[PDB]
Design an enzyme around this catalytic site. Structure first.
Site, mmCIF file in Angstrom:
data_model
loop_
_atom_site.group_PDB
_atom_site.id
_atom_site.type_symbol
_atom_site.label_atom_id
_atom_site.label_comp_id
_atom_site.label_asym_id
_atom_site.label_seq_id
_atom_site.Cartn_x
_atom_site.Cartn_y
_atom_site.Cartn_z
ATOM 1 N N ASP A 196 -4.264 2.207 -3.649
ATOM 2 C CA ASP A 196 -3.378 1.996 -2.221
ATOM 3 C C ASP A 196 -3.908 0.916 -1.512
ATOM 4 O O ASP A 196 -5.113 0.654 -1.751
ATOM 5 C CB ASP A 196 -3.414 3.246 -1.396
ATOM 6 C CG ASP A 196 -2.260 4.316 -1.641
ATOM 7 O OD1 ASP A 196 -1.819 4.022 -2.878
ATOM 8 O OD2 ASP A 196 -2.047 5.269 -1.104
ATOM 9 N N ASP A 197 -2.934 0.061 -0.658
ATOM 10 C CA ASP A 197 -3.477 -0.760 0.469
ATOM 11 C C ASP A 197 -3.710 -2.087 -0.179
ATOM 12 O O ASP A 197 -4.173 -3.035 0.789
ATOM 13 C CB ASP A 197 -4.749 -0.193 1.074
ATOM 14 C CG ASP A 197 -4.639 1.276 1.953
ATOM 15 O OD1 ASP A 197 -3.615 1.922 1.680
ATOM 16 O OD2 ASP A 197 -5.484 1.408 2.553
ATOM 17 N N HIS A 247 3.927 0.547 0.017
ATOM 18 C CA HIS A 247 2.971 1.283 0.617
ATOM 19 C C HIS A 247 3.352 1.177 2.185
ATOM 20 O O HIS A 247 2.375 1.234 3.028
ATOM 21 C CB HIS A 247 1.639 1.254 0.331
ATOM 22 C CG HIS A 247 0.477 2.228 0.894
ATOM 23 N ND1 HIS A 247 1.110 3.601 0.895
ATOM 24 C CD2 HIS A 247 -0.732 2.017 1.239
ATOM 25 C CE1 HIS A 247 -0.269 4.136 1.352
ATOM 26 N NE2 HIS A 247 -1.293 3.409 1.629
ATOM 27 N N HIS A 251 1.013 -0.339 7.109
ATOM 28 C CA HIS A 251 0.373 0.740 7.213
ATOM 29 C C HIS A 251 0.306 1.650 8.331
ATOM 30 O O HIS A 251 -0.642 2.390 8.741
ATOM 31 C CB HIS A 251 -1.138 0.605 6.852
ATOM 32 C CG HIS A 251 -2.045 1.666 5.824
ATOM 33 N ND1 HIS A 251 -2.553 2.970 6.456
ATOM 34 C CD2 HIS A 251 -2.062 1.818 4.642
ATOM 35 C CE1 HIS A 251 -2.845 3.639 5.448
ATOM 36 N NE2 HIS A 251 -2.855 2.864 4.475
ATOM 37 N N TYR A 288 -0.927 7.731 4.529
ATOM 38 C CA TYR A 288 -1.508 8.960 5.183
ATOM 39 C C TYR A 288 -0.849 10.141 4.845
ATOM 40 O O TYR A 288 -0.857 11.416 5.375
ATOM 41 C CB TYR A 288 -1.618 8.945 6.662
ATOM 42 C CG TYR A 288 -2.195 7.781 7.420
ATOM 43 C CD1 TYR A 288 -3.599 7.351 7.273
ATOM 44 C CD2 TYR A 288 -1.401 6.847 7.988
ATOM 45 C CE1 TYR A 288 -3.967 6.396 7.759
ATOM 46 C CE2 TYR A 288 -1.888 5.753 8.600
ATOM 47 C CZ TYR A 288 -3.322 5.257 8.412
ATOM 48 O OH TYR A 288 -3.713 4.288 9.119
ATOM 49 N N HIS A 338 -8.318 3.528 -3.961
ATOM 50 C CA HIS A 338 -7.981 2.484 -3.120
ATOM 51 C C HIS A 338 -8.591 1.153 -3.808
ATOM 52 O O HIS A 338 -9.927 1.261 -4.071
ATOM 53 C CB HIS A 338 -8.465 2.450 -1.828
ATOM 54 C CG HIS A 338 -7.834 3.568 -0.760
ATOM 55 N ND1 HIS A 338 -8.268 4.910 -0.996
ATOM 56 C CD2 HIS A 338 -6.854 3.409 0.072
ATOM 57 C CE1 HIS A 338 -7.376 5.425 -0.294
ATOM 58 N NE2 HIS A 338 -6.749 4.793 0.338
#
Ligand SMILES: [Zn+2]
Ligand SMILES: [Zn+2]
Ligand SMILES: [Zn+2]
Length: 384
Positions: A196-197, A247, A251, A288, A338
């Site tokens: 992720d991210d 994603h 965020h 989250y 991540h």
């Protein structure tokens, strides 16, 4: 009149005397005759109880002749038989003999030795079974079992949906085969690494090199905001055979935005991914893990959570990352990592080696969920 009643009584004895114990009594104006089945040399208690209950509450009968009797049937479960209870009421005050019967007034499940078989015995843990029942129930205890389905009171529920807590020993040939399929799939040793991210131009390339080195693929849930300036890197992720997911754009906690602003965080990301890659995997992981039913129901995407948090984002320590993976990963796990910080980059090789050493096959999210993937649905692992 007397002779006709005598004929009905003779007929029922000719039909049912054998293997039954006959009880006869007057209840008010009604005359009752009940044939209780024998298991060995004794009356099957639960059947008599069911009949007695009807006698007490429903029954009612003004001037009538009432018969109760049963027939054994297979239950569809191994070592369990059913006793179907029939109640027949004759009205004789009429010029002509009238009658009405209820073929399956009630039914009791029994063990071969005549003891009660209750729905809780079909599971290794009733508590959980009750829970899953509640679900498949709500979406869609006296019960029946037919053609691989549990029937409550009717709602037909696939037996498949309770395989995790079912006592498979009760399944006959067919259902035993269905269970075997479930078991074999449940025990397939697959794991999906997810990142992720990203993308992050300073770390994602290293992750890609490592995945290539180990001959495995992964799923990258990227932020829409990180696509600009990194278009070639996003294309590179896809060209190396990984799956690219959504994603959100920047965020935020999606469940704390208005419905359309949250949807747009998602669709703006679908749009830039589609522009850069030509297609979307239709996979979306909420920042989250925060999401609402309204958001999910508003978009034709599958929402992908996880069952294993590597905690790389918190520990920022290679040894900790490996330890979390070692202890948490299970068959069908979706591992949250991540690809934007060095600790994860550094730990990846030992994580891959450990899992390969334990016989795991690495899969992409689409490979893992394949036929289970549906729009609006939430997924935490291959099976949850
Ligand atoms: Zn009839
Ligand atoms: Zn994130
Ligand atoms: Zn839909």
């Amino acid at each position: 009149f007397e002779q006709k009643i005598e004929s009905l009584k003779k007929e029922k004895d000719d039909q049912l005397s054998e293997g039954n114990q006959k009880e006869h009594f007057r209840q008010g104006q009604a005359e009752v005759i009940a044939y209780y089945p024998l298991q060995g040399e004794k009356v099957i208690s639960s059947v008599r109880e069911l009949i007695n209950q009807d006698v007490k509450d429903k029954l009612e009968s003004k001037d009538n002749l009432v018969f109760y009797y049963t027939e054994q049937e297979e239950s569809g479960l191994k070592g369990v038989v059913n006793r179907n209870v029939t109640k027949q009421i004759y009205d004789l005050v009429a010029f002509k003999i009238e009658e009405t019967e209820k073929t399956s007034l009630g039914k009791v499940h029994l063990t071969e030795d005549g003891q009660p078989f209750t729905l809780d015995q079909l599971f290794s843990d009733a508590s959980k079974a009750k829970e899953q029942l509640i679900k498949e129930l709500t979406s869609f205890w006296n019960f029946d079992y037919k053609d691989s389905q549990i029937i409550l009171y009717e709602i037909a529920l696939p037996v498949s949906a309770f395989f995790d807590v079912i006592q498979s020993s009760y399944l006959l040939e067919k259902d035993a085969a269905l269970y075997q399929s479930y078991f074999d799939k449940k025990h397939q040793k697959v794991v999906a690494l997810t990142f992720d991210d990203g993308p992050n131009p300073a770390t994602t390339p290293q992750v890609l090199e490592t995945l290539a080195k180990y001959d495995i693929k992964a799923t990258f849930f990227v932020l829409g905001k990180n696509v600009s300036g990194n278009e070639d890197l996003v294309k590179r992720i896809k060209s190396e055979g990984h799956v690219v997911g959504n994603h959100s754009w920047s965020h935020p906690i999606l469940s704390q935005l208005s419905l359309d602003e949250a949807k747009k965080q998602i669709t703006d990301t679908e749009d830039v991914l589609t522009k850069v890659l030509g297609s979307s995997s239709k996979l979306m992981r909420p920042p989250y893990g925060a999401i609402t039913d309204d958001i999910r129901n508003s978009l034709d995407l599958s929402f992908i959570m996880w069952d294993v948090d590597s905690l790389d984002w918190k520990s920022k320590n290679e040894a900790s990352i490996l330890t979390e993976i070692q202890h948490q990963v299970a068959n069908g796990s979706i591992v949250l990592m991540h690809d934007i910080h060095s600790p994860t980059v550094n730990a990846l090789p030992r994580v891959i080696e450990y899992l390969k050493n334990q016989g795991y096959t690495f899969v992409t999210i689409p490979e893992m969920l394949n036929t289970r993937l549906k729009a609006h649905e939430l997924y935490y692992s291959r099976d949850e």
